[PDB]
Structure formats: structure tokens, C-alpha cells
């Protein structure tokens, strides 16, 4: 109910490590495939925990 | 007649309308390339660069259907207009001959 929102911007993101991290039980991507995340540029990323 | 042609501009409206109609049809056909048609994006490269083939195929098919429909509409309109222009050309040839 009080989910925390963090801003990620002005950096380089290596999603390959996150995808390969087996510690994540569920890794579902909807608007973009996980594999392609390493070859894309985004205006800004929101991380909600 | 020389003075009338030099002064008035709406004399050749018959040809100007044909030119305008063709240009407008081409413009509409080109603008139709910017429609999502329900896909996530209207850019084929963007679609291909964000999803794996199995998920991309759906958006690609939506775009294919939309653009195929646009082309069919344009070609049918062009066929009808070409028939009209052929009738006009036959009339012009008869007028010349007679």
C-alpha cells in the first residue's frame, strides 16, 4: 500500500546480469523481451519495490 | 483567347483537378504508414527491435493487414479513376478525329 518508487536515469544498465541471476523466481516482461533489453535506450526507468 | 489564358487561372481546372486528386491519393497512402492499426508501434523496425519473433509476429501481422487494406483501397480508387480518364481520352480522340 506504500510501495516505494525509485528513479533510474543517466546510467548504463546491464540487464543480462539480472536475467541470468537465478535468484529471481519470476521474470516477466510485457512491452519488451528480456533478451533485447541490452540493445535498447530508454528515456528513464522507474523501479517500484 | 490568348489574353484570357494569360489572365484567368481557373481555365485549366480540369487538368488541375486530376493532378490534385492523384497527389492527394498518394499523400493519403503515404500517411497510412503512420497508423498503429492496433499494434504497439507503427514502426516495423521498432517492433522488431523490442520483441522476440513469437511475440513480434502478432504486431507485424496487424501492421501487414492494415497496410494491405490501405494498398487495396488505393489501387481500387486508382483503377476507377483510370477508367474515368480513359473515357475522357476516348472522347478527346473522337473530338480530334472529327
UniProtKB/Swiss-Prot annotation, chain A:
Changing residue 18 to I: In strain: Omicron/XBB.1.5, Omicron/EG.5.1. Attaches the virion to the cell membrane by interacting with host receptor, initiating the infection. The major receptor is host ACE2. When S2/S2' has been cleaved, binding to the receptor triggers direct fusion at the cell membrane. When S2/S2' has not been cleaved, binding to the receptor results in internalization of the virus by endocytosis using host TFRC and GRM2 and leading to fusion of the virion membrane with the host endosomal membrane. Alternatively, may use NRP1/NRP2 and integrin as entry receptors. Binds to host ACE2. RBD also interacts with the N-linked glycan on 'Asn-90' of ACE2. Cleavage of S generates a polybasic C-terminal sequence on S1 that binds to host Neuropilin-1 (NRP1) and Neuropilin-2 (NRP2) receptors. Interacts with host integrin alpha-5/beta-1 (ITGA5:ITGB1) and with ACE2 in complex with integrin alpha-5/beta-1 (ITGA5:ITGB1). May interact via cytoplasmic c-terminus with M protein. May interact (via N-terminus) with host bilirubin and biliverdin, thereby preventing antibody binding to the SARS-CoV-2 spike NTD via an allosteric mechanism. This is Spike protein S1. It comes from Severe acute respiratory syndrome coronavirus 2.
Amino acid at each position: 500500500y506504500a510501495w516505494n518508487r525509485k528513479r533510474i536515469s543517466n546510467c548504463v544498465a546491464d540487464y543480462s546480469v539480472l536475467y541470468n541471476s537465478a535468484s529471481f523466481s519470476t521474470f516477466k516482461c510485457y512491452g519488451v523481451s528480456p533478451t533485447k533489453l541490452n540493445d535498447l535506450c530508454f528515456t528513464n526507468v522507474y523501479a517500484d519495490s | 483567347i490568348q489574353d484570357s489564358l494569360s489572365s484567368t487561372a481557373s481555365a485549366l481546372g480540369k487538368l488541375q483537378d486530376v493532378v490534385n486528386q492523384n497527389a492527394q491519393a498518394l499523400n493519403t497512402l503515404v500517411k497510412q504508414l503512420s497508423s498503429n492499426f492496433g499494434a504497439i508501434s507503427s514502426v516495423l523496425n521498432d517492433i522488431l527491435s523490442r520483441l522476440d519473433p513469437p511475440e513480434a509476429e502478432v504486431q507485424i501481422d496487424r501492421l501487414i493487414t492494415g497496410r494491405l487494406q490501405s494498398l487495396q483501397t488505393y489501387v481500387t480508387q486508382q483503377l476507377i479513376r483510370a477508367a474515368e480518364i480513359r473515357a475522357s481520352a476516348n472522347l478527346a480522340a473522337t473530338k480530334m478525329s472529327e
